[PDB]
Design a protein around this ligand. Sequence first.
Ligand SMILES: [Zn+2]
Ligand SMILES: [Zn+2]
Ligand SMILES: [Zn+2]
Ligand SMILES: [Zn+2]
Lengths: 816, 84, 211, 174, 103
Amino acid sequence: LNKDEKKERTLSMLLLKIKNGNTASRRTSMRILTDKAVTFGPEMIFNRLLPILLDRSLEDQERHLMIKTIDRVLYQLGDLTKPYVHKILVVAAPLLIDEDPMVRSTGQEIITNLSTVAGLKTILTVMRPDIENEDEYVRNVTSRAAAVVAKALGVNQLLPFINAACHSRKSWKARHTGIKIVQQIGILLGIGVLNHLTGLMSCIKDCLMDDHVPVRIVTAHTLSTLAENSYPYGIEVFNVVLEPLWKGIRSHRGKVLSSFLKAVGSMIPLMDPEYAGYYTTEAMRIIRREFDSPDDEMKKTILLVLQKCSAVESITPKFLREEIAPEFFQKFWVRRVALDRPLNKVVTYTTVTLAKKLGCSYTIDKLLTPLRDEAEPFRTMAVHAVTRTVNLLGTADLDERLETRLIDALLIAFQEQTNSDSIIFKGFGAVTVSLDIRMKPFLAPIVSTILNHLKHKTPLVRQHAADLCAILIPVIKNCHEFEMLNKLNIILYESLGEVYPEVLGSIINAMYCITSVMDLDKLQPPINQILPTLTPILRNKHRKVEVNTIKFVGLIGKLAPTYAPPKEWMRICFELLELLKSTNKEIRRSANATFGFIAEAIGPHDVLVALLNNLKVQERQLRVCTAVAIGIVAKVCGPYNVLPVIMNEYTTPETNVQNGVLKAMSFMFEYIGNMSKDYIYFITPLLEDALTDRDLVHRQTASNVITHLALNCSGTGHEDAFIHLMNLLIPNIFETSPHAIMRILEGLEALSQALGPGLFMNYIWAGLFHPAKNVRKAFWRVYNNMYVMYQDAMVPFYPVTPDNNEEYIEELDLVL
Amino acid sequence: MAEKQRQLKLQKIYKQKYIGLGDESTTREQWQRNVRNDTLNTLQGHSASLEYVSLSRGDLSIRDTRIHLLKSMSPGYKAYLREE
Amino acid sequence: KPSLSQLKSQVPYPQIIEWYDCDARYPGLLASIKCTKNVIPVPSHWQSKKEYLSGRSLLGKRPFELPDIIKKTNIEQMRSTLPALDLDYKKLHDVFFKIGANWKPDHLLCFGDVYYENRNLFEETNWKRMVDHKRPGRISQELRAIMNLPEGQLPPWCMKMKDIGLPTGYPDLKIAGLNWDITNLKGDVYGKIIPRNYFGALISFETPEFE
Amino acid sequence: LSKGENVPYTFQDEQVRSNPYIYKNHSGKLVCKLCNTMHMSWSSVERHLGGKKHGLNVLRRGISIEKSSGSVGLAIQVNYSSEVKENSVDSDDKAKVPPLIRIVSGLELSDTKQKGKKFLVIAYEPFENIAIELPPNEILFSENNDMDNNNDGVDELNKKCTFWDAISKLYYVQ
Amino acid sequence: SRHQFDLIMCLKQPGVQTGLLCEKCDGKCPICDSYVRPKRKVRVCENCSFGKQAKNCIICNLNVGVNDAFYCWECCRLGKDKDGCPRILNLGSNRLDRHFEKK
RNA sequence: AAAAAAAAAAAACUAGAUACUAACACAUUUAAUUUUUUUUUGUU
Ligand SMILES: [Zn+2]
Ligand SMILES: [Zn+2]
Ligand SMILES: [Zn+2]
Ligand SMILES: [Zn+2]
């Protein structure tokens, strides 16, 4: 007791620490559980742990921490009794319905692990009494749970269970949820339903004919999910169910006719061209009859059938313009549509899919009246449709008149906008990019509007004003007005001192698009005055300002190195080297990219001293990014400049400077692909000391050098240095820790292609069997990787003689 | 922990794709069978090493040597030759 | 579990077989592989619990030294290490390509070598370099000061060679005043040993040019 | 933490150390050369010295060291300080011990160049040693001068033929 | 992936369709996460394409993908190119713990 | 007078001290599409 009650205390203290505890506390207690999970009784682990998850006081944060523990224990113990299976399904099962897909996925990993742990037989015995439940919620849950189990264990093993529930005459809800299981199985497997669809079809067909309507509807939705997930192939099976859908459509009306038209509508694109024409023309009558249906469901289905039928070749586009289209636009573009999003998406996408058959000028023609409507959120939807339609079809169809009215409505609806959205930018941009040469007579007022909007007091309208310039700059070059480029660039450079960062970044982006396009010498400010006004901006903190500023400065580094004096460039370097403490990634990547531009601009040796001075800092981001910077400098200005300086720097006694030296060398090797050959020979005595050194970090990082060196230096004909390097590596095979061992293994694999498969194998065959169960476990891994890289390449190299193995091969000893 | 548990999984996958991969304990027979299959596949695959085996064995046709090599991959093929 | 004496009898090179090789699952096969032609044995730091490196050997290792070719480039004086650069790009580019084209490390390693913990290459290279320069018949000035043997004076063992004869392993060794003229003794040398194209000769050597 | 002391690197080829063990290797980390331990910070070092294993290694080094390692005569008159500097040290620490003489063979010298003669070395705690070359194989080497009285002092030489005027600080030897 | 162990790839027979990367993961080898020197386009199996999941990035499988994903030159030299479909399935512990850490 | 032919530390437990690795991840994320769940019950 008192000895084992101490264990009962340890599990409680641990679980407490994970749920409510410090970060470094729970982080270690997780390790303690994962390593000690086998020695604690799963009766005690789950018996203690599960009661926590039932109460309502737990937050999502504290809940996921317990969930993670459940997953880590289940994946280990490997065998579990059925009561705990039922409990874990009671806790984990509700997660599949949760509001956000993260909780869905993490609750899904539980059941997909338990399905393997608990095995096939147990879970099915747990579900059988559950499907019969009178509750709606539980049945809803374990439909999804049952599907997750189905994908996890394969569907065929669980199929006769579904057949039993579906075909069961005993209970009705068993039929219902037994049919829903086919829904979520169809969803999870995706296209992979396919081969199983016949077996699944054993359920649906007869289960469709139940006297109760809510089953008849569920089967209709299953036919839709299977029909869409299948795609064209599945036709041959659905022919058996194709007949009753028609005797169901022509009668039941109401909410059922919606479901059956969803089914048949989803069946259309997989039908042969002969039948497609028939079944479409049959469906279109009911569609037109049902236009006035107030029900959201039925409208949603109508948009589906119109959505699919346009792809059918039988119906002609003239047939659509004469009849279906005008009845479409007037009914489904009513401003009451624009208020609810889920139906907005469907109407817009339906119009877009109709744009293929219909004329582009016809679709856009019907879409100009909604653009000129007064309602703002309605004009927004009217924008979305034009955006996606123009993206697909292009502007080549448009006559000058529609081309004028469209852009007019886009200017108007552009200037009154409220919410922040790119749909105008892209869309109003997608227009410009398409018709750009034809844009010229319209370009003068547009820019003027921008020049007004920049002076507006609201920050959003200033964002949206600056953003639209960056899209126009390329088409403004195509329209040849350079004076407008200069006038813009001047006005932006004057507005460049704005307070609000979110607008200022966009301003600098427009500056970027202007500078890349226009002739460098003709820029008014000019660049030489531009840059010293940029250098204080790098300290603006935030992010977007930093990102856009850095990319722009890099653009200057490419195009205009000679203007700013080298001392100013050094100010830039000292600001960036400080700036890359930023938490964001692209900030650091862009910064490191700019060091190549500056090192090319001014010189390598003035930058390198500054970088190497920064490797003495404790933080890891700084050291690693300065390593990448040294790599890029070595690439752009050549390795012969950087290599002696770095090899000198490696002599320092400090650890972090040495590791940084090795890493910077890794990057500078992977950046120059072929070169790499002249430079080895010098660095093998540098790797000599790295692979020898006591701590496990040098031996790790140096092997990474050996990977990038041996891969692209192979076949060059050195090969006497790689034998040396290998002779230094092989003893490291026994080393533990994940990071060193993966880098060492990668190193041996790279050296396999420098030495060759046989010359590399001569080391391994020895301990490839061996008594020691460990040396064996270590070498079979390298033999695995070598076998994956080489199968017929190792064939001459096996250590096999006629008396070494029983059969051998009699034909290897033949000589002619 | 989780890393090793991925190592086992990729082990099971690559052992399926590439057939023979030694894990830790593999019997000498289990490994020598893989060696035999690789060697025979090289002998048959390259038309060079197939010409060499065909002329050396003096068989009447190339296809006889190739099918001889394929058949040799089954264990019972030795005994089958002995019953002739 | 066949005894290793029974096991060593199967092997053409029985001296490799070890007491633990007896205990393998497949000793007959393992003894055939391990003594097969070119197979190099497993590194020997298994069965040791020291994590393959214990500082006892590692405490006294030298931090690093640049190759003499790179040390010639003068960076050692420019950047101070233990305890603005103004370098010529033509110079550095000539060091790696033109000057150091054929330069290779002094030692490297052979095929069969494997680096065990207590091994140190810095001594072995000094031993090769030792055997190269140090020769019979010659003595350095420092060792002559240690022996108090001025130049032009025969070493003290010359008499025991007069009685007993010349060195056995040095038949061609010529010593002043015995088998070799006494006047030719000068400075540090009192004795001296006095006993193609390989089809691919490149006949032209041209490095890739920078300009 | 370090008490401002400079801990030299292992390779610097030896200012006396406090503890002549803890170093910094070619890398950054701190080492104890006896126990062969790597320490991250000086506090961990102070815990090593205050640890039990380091004591065991110090003792084992202690044992390891403790197991291995009618005629003519001359007369000399050596004079010493006149209460000039000996006024600061009077704590009966061998103060009662008189100067000592020994005959040393030149076969061993700090330079080891020439040799082959003896020296009559004379030593006193503070002052520096003094030597006198004795080419003659034997002089004044008497035969039972006194009547065999056994207070060896240091050796037969010292009692036999030395006088220490401690009141005047004059050491006579003959 | 390379840096994150809990991730599980697909590794099925690559289909005829090219994977896609989000703007954030843009320009990265799906295997070793190397930004430099691309070589070939990735190809994903049927069961990794199907519907909306096809549009997601093949690394983070959250954001929508835009550019085609490339194997770096080294992963083509090692042959890790042709292993199979290099699509990550689960999201990993890091992303989830971020999501619930923030809120 | 002599020579000494080259190997020792632990492990375990429990807590505490401190370096460090992995271009690890860090503000974007939302216009086709599945948590959208009810005893069917919206009429030329
Ligand atoms: Zn110590
Ligand atoms: Zn896939
Ligand atoms: Zn991504
Ligand atoms: Zn790659």
